[PDB]
Amino acid sequence: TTIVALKYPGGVVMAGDRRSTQGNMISGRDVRKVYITDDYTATGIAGTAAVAVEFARLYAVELEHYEKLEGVPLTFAGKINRLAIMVRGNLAAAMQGLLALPLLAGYDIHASDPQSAGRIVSFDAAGGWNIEEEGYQAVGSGSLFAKSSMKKLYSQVTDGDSGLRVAVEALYDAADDDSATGGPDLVRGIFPTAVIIDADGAVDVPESRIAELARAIIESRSG
Amino acid sequence: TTIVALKYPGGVVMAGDRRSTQGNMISGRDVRKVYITDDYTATGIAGTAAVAVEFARLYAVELEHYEKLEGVPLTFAGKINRLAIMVRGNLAAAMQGLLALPLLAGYDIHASDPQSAGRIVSFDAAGGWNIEEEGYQAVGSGSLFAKSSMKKLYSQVTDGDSGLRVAVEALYDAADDDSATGGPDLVRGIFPTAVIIDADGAVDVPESRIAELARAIIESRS
Amino acid sequence: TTIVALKYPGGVVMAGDRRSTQGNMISGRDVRKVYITDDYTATGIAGTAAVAVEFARLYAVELEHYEKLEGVPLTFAGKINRLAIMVRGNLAAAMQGLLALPLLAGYDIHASDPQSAGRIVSFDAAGGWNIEEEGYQAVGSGSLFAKSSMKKLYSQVTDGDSGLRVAVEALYDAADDDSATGGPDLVRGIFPTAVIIDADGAVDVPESRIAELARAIIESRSG
Amino acid sequence: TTIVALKYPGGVVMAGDRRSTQGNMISGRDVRKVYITDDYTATGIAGTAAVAVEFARLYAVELEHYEKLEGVPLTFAGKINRLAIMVRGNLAAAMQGLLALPLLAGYDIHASDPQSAGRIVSFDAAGGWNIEEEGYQAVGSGSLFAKSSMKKLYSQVTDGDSGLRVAVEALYDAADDDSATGGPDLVRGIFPTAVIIDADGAVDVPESRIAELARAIIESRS
Amino acid sequence: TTIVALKYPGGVVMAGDRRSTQGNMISGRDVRKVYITDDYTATGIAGTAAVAVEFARLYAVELEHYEKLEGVPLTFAGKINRLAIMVRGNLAAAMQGLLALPLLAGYDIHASDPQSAGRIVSFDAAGGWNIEEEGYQAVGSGSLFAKSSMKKLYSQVTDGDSGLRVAVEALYDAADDDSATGGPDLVRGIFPTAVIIDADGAVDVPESRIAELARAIIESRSGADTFGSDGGEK
Amino acid sequence: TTIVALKYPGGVVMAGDRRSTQGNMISGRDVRKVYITDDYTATGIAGTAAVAVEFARLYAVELEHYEKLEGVPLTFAGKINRLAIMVRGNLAAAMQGLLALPLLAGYDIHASDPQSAGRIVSFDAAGGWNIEEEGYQAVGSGSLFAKSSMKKLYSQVTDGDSGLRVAVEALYDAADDDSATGGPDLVRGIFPTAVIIDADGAVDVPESRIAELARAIIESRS
Amino acid sequence: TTIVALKYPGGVVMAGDRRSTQGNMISGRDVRKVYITDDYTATGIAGTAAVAVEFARLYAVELEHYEKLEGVPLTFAGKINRLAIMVRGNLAAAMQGLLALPLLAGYDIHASDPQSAGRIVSFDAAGGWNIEEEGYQAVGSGSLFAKSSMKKLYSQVTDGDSGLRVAVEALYDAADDDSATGGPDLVRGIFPTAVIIDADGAVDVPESRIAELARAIIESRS
Amino acid sequence: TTIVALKYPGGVVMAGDRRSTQGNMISGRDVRKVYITDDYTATGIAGTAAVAVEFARLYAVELEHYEKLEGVPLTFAGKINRLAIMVRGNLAAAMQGLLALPLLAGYDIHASDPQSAGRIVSFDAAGGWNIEEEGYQAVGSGSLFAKSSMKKLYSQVTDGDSGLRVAVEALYDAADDDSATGGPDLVRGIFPTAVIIDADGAVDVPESRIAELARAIIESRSGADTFGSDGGEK
Amino acid sequence: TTIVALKYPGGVVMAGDRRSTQGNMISGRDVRKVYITDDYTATGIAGTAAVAVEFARLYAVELEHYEKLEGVPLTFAGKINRLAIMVRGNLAAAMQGLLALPLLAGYDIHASDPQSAGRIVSFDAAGGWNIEEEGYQAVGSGSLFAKSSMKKLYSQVTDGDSGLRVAVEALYDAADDDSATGGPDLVRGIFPTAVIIDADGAVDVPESRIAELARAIIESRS
């Protein structure tokens, strides 16, 4: 599994692969790992698939429950604290083989500067959180390769489209160097899923655009 | 890793993949796992790459040493016995995580019927050997998927080219269902290697033929 | 044990073998492993036989209990969630040897297109569920061989009868490659059980049809 | 794996199944487990397949080596002693999962009464041996079922043909109650192998007769 | 310990041996292992003797308690479920050396065909139950030999008497191949106990009939040994 | 991680590094480890980063809660006791790997002499606390090197500016001798964070002054 | 520790860092990890420093011994085989923590095309070796980051100078992401060491050129 | 135990403490830990005392044996290699608690520049060696404190006397921060031992010079403590 | 750590060292280990510093709590019983590495003879208490050396001053033979603390008197 998130002027984009494996055997080819928790945040979770799905569902339920109870959505730091508390509480299960590491990307509406309202938060196994100030972050087995690719490709990010292309290329590199991460499957037409968040909210990227970007990257690397 | 071998009328063909991994990390993309030990036998070894290369080299050295010393090549049963002895002697190291399971394909010149002179021999971790009578066998992590694919596809084998196509398709299925087995890499132009053995000896299949077969299979499945 | 399920236009069919073993000794020859939990779903469970029977009974009781209490049956995703919860709760006992891996197939009456209303759901040991999109799935010791056979045979499925024949042939292959899976016993006249679900509900396949299909397959492979 | 042997007036017969498994997965369908060590004895070995093959080969080599060196074959007691010594020496490796339990059947040319010259010898894991006096014995995973079937069926043994039928039926029962023992494969046409030993020596039973007996048994139980 | 049960037209018969051992020592010679839980079911339990007796008593108490409370006896499947629940509950004690494997035989008064109303149920260590429909079943250490003997002898069963003879012969074979199972003791006059269930209920078999059957079986075996040989050698 | 604190005439200064690591990999470059708990105390915590942040937040919340409830801030000894109790209660988690060692520096308004109101308190894993009377203290992996540098550089401290320079140089030495402690990153413009406490309360040192001091130290050692 | 190697038209280059650590403590700042084994091959060894130095010394001694004895240097395959044998023989001691993973770069004078005479060979802990065909390879703790940086930067390599700059930048990235790898120390004037091999042989790169390249990279990334 | 060695223009100096402990108990107060192996090298060993003495004795014997056999002393690299081989061969016994870490200081007569002929070599437990380039090194339990003190005090080293004073002060700091290192004992008159190597060979420093240097250091420390304050309070 | 207590005509004197260590490193130089629990008893606790401080604080709180509740101070035996109960209850924590061994010295107001009213009580790890009748006792790592010194020096005790000198000399000997015990620091001017208890209560000994005694002892032994 590999999930990447990066900031661009005016928003943030998160993308993830589609492969789930049980050892060396491939058990899934269309797993979705990026979820829209609310109108302005997206969460990607790596590790055990069942724990990831349960975590995303519970986190979305908790956020919506607070919003309905109080009539006002939580602040971004409050959402970070809730996710960190959940990760800290899952420590005993993580030590038993049910580890789940989330990745939070969101748009801060209350931020003073709309062009710097994108936020990326990374979590560790002990529940600690850190707000990324370098503009990109990745989680999963292929996270290191994706981060090293983004370190060189981040100078090309100028808007949403370029950021999406860079994220797709980072996922392609991660799948190229990690067997647990699946690359663009042209035979079955299965492509990574992406979410773009801006001032108008979080929307899902259509599959056609991601397919076009993946084909362009493959053609560029073929010669 | 996955290595397949199947019999066709008049010969035998063996093919293997190119991927080698260290856990979940891909460390090799062009490893050659099928060797031509002599003029009529080919050996594919799965497991640890270092042990596989060492075993292939030592086995070829031993066979050529006997042939030069005695002036006559060993019989097929003798080659089977020597390979089984090597596998049996490697048991202690295999129990430490250095397992290596070879697959042997050959063309018996001393066989009575030329059309049934192909031979496929499989080996287990205890050194036991068994001559396969179903006409196909596979070894490696993805061996089960390739064997099950060949079970359905073996009815289409009537010559060397059809057998090569079936072997390539079986390797494609094994790589499709196993992450440790590499499929045809179209971006880098890396394709599985194959060896065809017949009455005229053992030759390496050119890369262009395997590339054409792999592209045909990919177009068929898309 | 081996249980197979596959989708055909307008429905879904699930079949399972009849053999239970205690190590190498054969203890049962007519075990039924496919249950009709309600009018539009069928459940096949592999692993320990006692745990499978208890799971099927408890799951059917829970579904009927909810339907009677609320006056309306659960949605398909609700049934999936309840089964996943049961599997997740059984994890501690599964680690001790009482492992149970279910397989759920159903027909969604609320689905948009009637011809694509068939559903197949697979579960893992951690409770993770995945709605299968390939059109077939299998569980049990001989699951791999049956799945590989269905991969090559699924192109022939065009209606309920062809799908049933493909399922029977996949079970035959699984029994041919797995000693823990029982094949068609012609001496005792014992054949695998199958269930077909369509718009009219779930019905049991009569033994005569399955016996005829098994004899046809055996005669096909004998020459 | 299941190997049976029973005595009939004027000789002895030994039969064994053909299946070899690796856990629950079937790996072999035509394994031959009964060997003709010399002109008047046959040896069937259960357990690990590789160890069984190696034991049979080494035992035959040792017996033939002694016969060539001395110009006179070993007495039956000497053969029993050598096999027991081999089993005793294999104890340390058997404790590591390489167990091999042989079954020895032979015809004693030097015996007084020719009609009772048949001999059946069983072995344990500690190397001990015992000459059976009840007329039948079996080894392997399905040995108990085969012996319990032969206990009821032994009263019908009056000649070589009836003894062969009883042995085939016992193997059928063992395969019926045990998954590790393969039954008659009518689809593939694979049947258990048998060896008949009498005053004229040890010969291999033709496959057609065993197929006829198996089909008769199946029709009887259908 | 070995308990056998087989179906005959019109009923069912269950029999068990009389020996209890502590290792290689023989600690008991007249232990009774077949119980009449109610008017139409009999239960035999193998394993630890104390756990077997406690299980039989508790199961009978539970069945009679339900019958008295509700005024109607449980259905056969209900009794099967209660016994399976008890076996499943005893899993922790079984893992510590207190295993008890029961064997349930009964007559279903509510069954459609009176001649096929007999039922035999077998249980495993995990509490799973399977209604045996091949006509016979056995439990205990010598269960395999008795089951294999019944496989060859079941074709002779035509009524209650033949079924009882087959059960006694199966127990004799099991004791012949198992040291932990006691055989017919002619010196002390101790014979296995049997229960026959039919449309009129479950009744204990008198010892005289079982003694006669055991003597006939022993005489037949001795005569066969006299007639038989080791392929021509005695 | 390395956090240093030292007393100067009229107050106290505490500084810490910015690097967090996961084994050998560098995962953080702008981590803040010095917190202003209230108007006159600053707390720096070393060890696991998550536990440090949680402890700082909980300690500040508890102090403010007591102040709001009673209408009067806790005495310095009361704050020491609360922090020691928290450390003692975290012992079980620390033995499992979640170890956190805090360092407390504060200004005592109720002290007799204003010039000697600076306070430095050190803690151990067992919850024991000691008020340092030597003028400096350091915690973390690089604590030994920083303390040994401060032992030689403390004679130059005469006011807040010289004390801040000495603290920055001690952090530079700790980073120079320890890989887990990050030095002044001139490429990214990241410098250690410091807090100065005096009679007017606790304030954060602007980054420009610390950058100037670090550049001066680097020029001195070049 | 990080040692990189990459191929450029007409030669090959290898560079390594200078830091040696003991846990989180920095124990060495001017360690040399790249050795010139002979006139056309260079070897860099990662892992335990003592084992690396001993391996380099012994390997150079063996190569020179063979060259002096036979009057002709070993072929490149022979050198690869000897290094693989040494790595395989060190497996038992590596299991105790004395691990050494070498990287071999050389120039094949017997190669047909002079522009493709460069060779890069990597080794695993089991003694297996693989001739890299993608043009670059790295070993050590920071090997992954350096390799991923070279993957992006390899398109700029056209001659020796560009290859040297790319190798220096890859080492800079590896030090930037790994704390066990030392970066260019401008305060002490310590820079990574590099070796360039071409048709004229292997020579050590002067420190001034590497210092200029490192300063250019630092100013580029500032 | 703490042994220090630093370079000065024209030579090298090595010094060590005198205390040996068995846990928290003081067992020795006048242990000599710096040996003159030959005319131009000095070796100090930290760790177990017995292993240290045996190491120094065997190393000196080996060097003298080679010099007598060949008629020419070993080069400095040869001595380093022999000591590294000894350390590597002692690894198995060091893993059982018999650890010995040597420190080597020497004066290479074959070096080009006479003023930079001093050499300091440090060894690890795996037998690896490194020629120090910073001009000072220390080994022992208190090595970190002595090395950190020398890092600050090395700017004052201009000749042999100043280097000796710096080494004595580093040992004083190491003893001040480590309980296993013994400080100058004024009551018993026991002081650290030092060896200084120059172009004329290796000689032992007389005890009076070290005693007066230690006394001056103690007086300076006491005066600084009197002058200083805890940020305003004493 | 070492704490000594001895009886002199008319009272009792208790003294202790000032050093706290973490293995071989010295972490504290002015630790106070003798506490005035109430007007007529003093308690010295050895072992872990945190446990000792907590024990002293809790014991003083309990004694004052009882005195305030009942309006009458506890008898000496009641204080002994409470301290023994606390020590016994701390057994589980002591077995895990948090051992604390106290030493109680007091003056009995209700005793018959004023000149023999001094009391010394020692405790073991199991909570057992014993009223010492030998006239002196010591606890800590250097307790044996201090007790052996007092065994020879106790004949010189005739009043409070001589007893204080003997206690100081015993502490000096304990520090002389034990590295974990701190001796008189004449560079920093740190000396052991002492408490003198008599009919007028318990008073802390001024540092000047102890410094004079320590200097006299050092000059005597020089």
Numbering used by the authors:
A (entry chain P), C (entry chain J): 301 to 523
B (entry chain M), D (entry chain H), F (entry chain R), G (entry chain S), I (entry chain L): 301 to 522
E (entry chain U), H (entry chain W): 301 to 534
Lines quoted from the article behind this entry:
The initial 2D and 3D image processing scheme visualized a class with Mpa-bound proteasome in addition to a class containing uncapped 20S CP. The structure of the 20S CP particle was determined by focused refinement using a binary mask for this region and was resolved at 2.8 Å resolution. It demonstrates that the C-terminal extensions of Mpa containing the terminal GQYL motifs are able to adopt a conformation facing outside of the Mpa pore, and that their GQYL motifs occupy the binding pockets between the proteasome α-ring subunits upon complex formation. We tentatively assigned six GQYL motifs based on their proximity to the respective Mpa protomers. The last GQYL motif was not assigned to any of the Mpa protomers and was included as a separate chain in the model.
In mycobacteria and other members of Actinobacteria, prokaryotic ubiquitin-like protein (Pup) serves as a degradation tag post-translationally conjugated to target proteins for their recruitment to the mycobacterial proteasome ATPase (Mpa). The bacterial 20S proteasome interacts with a ring-shaped AAA regulatory complex called the mycobacterial proteasome ATPase (Mpa) in mycobacteria or ARC (ATPase forming ring-shaped complexes) in other actinobacterial species. Here, we use single-particle cryo-electron microscopy to determine the structure of Mpa in complex with the 20S core particle at an early stage of pupylated substrate recruitment, shedding light on the mechanism of substrate translocation.
